[model samples]
Target chain A: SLTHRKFGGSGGSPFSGLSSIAVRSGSYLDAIIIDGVHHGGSGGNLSPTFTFGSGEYISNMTIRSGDYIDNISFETNMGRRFGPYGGSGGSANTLSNVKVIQINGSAGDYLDSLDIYYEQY
Target chain B: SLTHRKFGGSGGSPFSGLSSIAVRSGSYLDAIIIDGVHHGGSGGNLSPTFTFGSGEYISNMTIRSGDYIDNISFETNMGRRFGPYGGSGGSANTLSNVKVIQINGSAGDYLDSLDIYYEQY
Candidate 1:
């Protein structure tokens, strides 16, 4: 039951867009409410980590874009050009009986969500 | 408790591109093991189907990219593109508390990842 939500201001390199989701249900969806604006990349730490596997119970969710899979930062190894780097950007999952899934690679679809300037930001 | 993974051959036109994810923790990750080759879009069902609520228990995760939010096929109402559709592609959720997040939009980033031929065949 670890729930937290906070959003203020910050742009540029918070791991914004590539491929990221990590949070296996130990209770922790804290502060993943960004209002769009991470130009440099890694913006707002690129939120999309989910691993609800312990009496799992997800809720109304929204990840309007892609990239940011924290490999536990290599369990703290952290080495690559940044951190947790592999195939960054592309995924969409909304659970809790709602059902949703979308993960990608090989660079076919370059990631685009109409023109809402990144839906639900 | 639905788990399926199959991949043999399929090329182009199935509904590939622009965000797609819909699985919401019921159970169904079938035939999502494509071995590169969706040349003209919709090649191999695109893969990445997950939704583990109700006693949730996610695992060794990886969603390299994003899009796909099923509206239960419009809760069986059915309409958009003959099925569920939304921000269309972009997410990376590896939870269970492992912690990771990455969802996107706003045609700015263009989605790119070093080019390993889409990593993980």
Candidate 2:
């Protein structure tokens, strides 16, 4: 299915698109793999938070924007979490899955924060 | 000494300065109480992360800014963390200490995320 494919480009998902993809608020899916070319934004400085419960993950998600990612975070206590890349400078990748829980800094800043419960499956 | 104050307006610390107080990167202080008018930012979209160990807190810190707060968060497992207010439209207070571990969105967006350990002193 399109669910297990590596995410990127402009097509059916954030993983298959070249322009940008919106996360389309809400939850249900078991995981989100963010990889290559995408964009997400809130009002002026507002951001979105993604909280995954046990057995969920938002892995390999990366995107870029001109403005700034006001405040975005991916938090989990009983599941595996991964790193996110992109910010001001427009192109930078940092952190691994189950690494940062929050990323804060300048536009081009690549960072994040989080406490992981690495699940070895 | 002055650490006992309710944090606000110009003086000696971020709680004492009237204009704006720089968190001054690095860790040493066990806690920071943010209250009343204040301002903080990184280069363009870069932000500073303040991680408090066990028994530390950055409580009640509130500030406003014309620009957006790229990314900022407070994550802990054994301490009490609080709410942060400010951003674009720049004047709103949401969440209580231990209510969030990360806050993201528009400039004036007041929010955060976290799982509390709530210590009883």
Candidate 3:
């Protein structure tokens, strides 16, 4: 099943698919790196790199945020785990499973919000 | 099944999922609009609008191209038909199947090239 939902502010773009995911976080998550593009703030310590393998894709994302992204994690179709990257605070949002088809959001010095499209398997 | 591929160049953005797909064409495809954003040329004749219904997504597409997009047509999950929306001068190609996750490529006065990402069911 393909499920879609949107959240956050006005900034928008296409969801090309996932290539790799990297996060920049310090006291909070300052940025989100998808494919090779950066969203949100800059410099923190780049978290562990998460790259998609051949035919591999994101199945689910558990996101936590408040003033900034407190934590972000992922589960792939292969049942692989990525993170709980960042600290704990805020509420947790579990985006439906799949490979993501689109992403919508706005970012400032930190990740403010997100809208994710999912192809749940 | 979900499949993917890219056919054009440098310009890039997130694949924010599809809302509606519109095309501008004259002798060839002049431009492409995903959701409400336009890509490629400004105007020729706006093709018939292709909007996604509730839970609706693209099932497959047959595209013809050469100097520009000569024709582009679609089939949805409900077995709906959209078009061969332009001229018929170019080579024929078929995208594997359903729901474009991303689009890549460039255009000027016409649709110069395209790279589409698909989630084949």
Candidate 4:
């Protein structure tokens, strides 16, 4: 996937690359681990890890955001579903038919919002 | 200022309030100092600070955003204007007839985007 661009806020460390993911959330998104890199602050409870299978990749996802990253969910090409992670709040944003490549978002005490870099497939 | 809303991506410090601002940018917006809170990563040459005066308020402005905050410009009730800041890239977005109350945008290695909260007065 060569075509890539990003969306989201400006707060914490840039979380990039994807093969696996785990989330920590409470009232806010405490931390998010995409592959080996941890973005956002350490605060909330950790969710079950979601890893890609052979030739598996993201098909689409929804980003629920407000003052911060409120919630998110992923659906893959292999028909696997992971998360609706975090609390229900904020507005809903959706993207379809793309492979998430990197996350260039803000990282601080808590995950203020969410960003995703992707290429259409 | 009672009515408030924000626009921009999901990233960095949720910088709120407006009094003064300075920015660091090149081809990309690297840092923004809103009031005293520095948002974005540590890079880019700093711009001269722009401050609001007594009874001054934002009248209208344009947000240049696309793959990031490409550029921005502000205008005040006192016939003051600031910026066209950052680079020339992005799509133009505008909010007319308003007084800015707070700012809460996504921040990262560079400012990926911005969310301006304001009240129509």
Candidate 5:
């Protein structure tokens, strides 16, 4: 079975007020699906959508306005489980985010129900 | 987009008599889904269902009794396209088979309409 996780971050100073986050692939053969949009950033803005493969990765990976990270999620390799990394901000100083560590996959791992835009970016 | 191919072999000597087929991965990250139960074999029997991943792969990979192979199909990384390599038989002296070379995948790559048993074997 495959699974994903969601986490969070924060904003304030150079280290507090939502800096950028990085993603990397360990033994995970599959790529990481990032919902960069849905989340909020500085000045109440939303991030964009992005996908990352093996190796060094980075994204806006921001949090939402209501004192949290808005739209950022990680889909496991085969959509196994929506792991426990999602987040909700606390104050204007804090945001939510995730750091994808690993993903899983199987043989007949058919991943239907995919969004058509997936094939593009 | 991902793709698969099917090729043929012969059956007469140890080197021919539908000896067996081997599958391998060449820079392809995704696993190989095999329909081992559909095609015909030695005594006109069907193979079993099997899924394989990267590295040296082996299977009954048999040919159908009607001088061809049966019950075997290769789905590329994503449901891209059925590449150029399916097969038919020439004579009882020959059989059909596929040597899975490489498969592909993308960001939001999805594969719906999958069988439940896929989770097991």
Candidate 6:
């Protein structure tokens, strides 16, 4: 349902809509995809506000936190949230692949977090 | 080869026969199997006397290091001994599935260890 989505907004007009969308959609789908958004933290330090697999399995899933996903993965997935995007950050699950991405902190990195498609199974 | 096999013996009667056997056989084979024997440390701190996989693989095997086997496993294996009975103990590997198996301690208890089967890889 690629109608219109907005992740964490920038400084001028912060967009918190898509993040809720990401959380809602991720609660029930298997995979996730995101676009046209500026959300969450990344790099070595930043942690996903949400994590996956702290509880159940949302198999065959994909997450495109869009160039800003830190300390999160699907396979070795672990953290705060625990589904597709579980918790914040620590040792449980740190970024597996930075894959030529940037990171951010010292801001609203928490609101910057997002979880995508993972239908309840 | 069912001949004369003496693992770690009691106090003065220290027989380190099977350890070498376990190591030798495990060096070449895949799996392994251990039988009755008085061996090394057990329960908590007592680590395996040796370890493998810092090397290669030696398939199907079993170990009966008598009443003492600290930290060791195969699939989730990450302990000391091989030929089934691999090495001593530590955190990289601690006692897993410690079933109904008795865990020996100090008489003060210690000085326990052993290893079992495997041919060649």
- Which candidate has the highest lDDT of all? 4
Best-first order by DockQ: 4, 3, 1, 5, 2, 6
Query: What does fnat come to for each candidate?
Result: 0.03, 0.01, 0.05, 0.16, 0.01, 0.00
Better of 5 and 6 by DockQ: 5
Quote each prediction's TM-score. 0.17, 0.21, 0.49, 0.45, 0.18, 0.19
Model 2 chain A poorest ten-residue lDDT run: A12-21
Candidate 6 docking classification: incorrect
Instruction: List model 1 lDDT by residue over B1-121, tens digit each.
Output: 2111111122211211112233221121111211121111122233343322222222123333322211122111121211232222444332223211222222112212211111111
Badly placed stretches (over 4 Å) of model 2 are A1-121, B1-51, B57-89, B103-121
Tens-digit lDDT track of model 4 for B2-31: 211232245564321245677788766787
Q: Could you tell me which 10 consecutive residues in candidate 4 chain B have the lowest summed lDDT? A: B1-10
lDDT of each candidate versus the true structure: 0.22, 0.23, 0.63, 0.64, 0.20, 0.24
Question: Who wins the DockQ comparison?
Answer: 4
Ranked by lDDT from best down, the candidates are 4, 3, 6, 2, 1, 5
The residue-by-residue lDDT of candidate 5 on B4-108, one tens digit each, is 111111211111101122222221111112221111112221223333333223211221112111122333232322221223421112111222221111111
Clashes (backbone N, CA, C under 3 Å), per candidate, total 100, 67, 11, 27, 36, 65
lDDT of 3 by residue, A8-100 (tens): 112122223345678888756777776545666776778877876654667777887654567788888778888777777777777654566
Which regions in candidate 3 have their CA more than 4 angstroms from the true location?
A1-101, A104-121, B1-16
Supply candidate 2's per-residue lDDT for A69.
26
Give the per-residue lDDT of model 6 (tens digit) for A1-121: 1111111112121111111113222211221222112232232222233322212222322333322232233432222233445333222322332211111111132323332212222
In angstroms, the error of model 5 at B113 is: 26
Better of 1 and 2 by DockQ: 1
lDDT by residue for model 6 (B69-96), tens: 3223343133333324334322132232
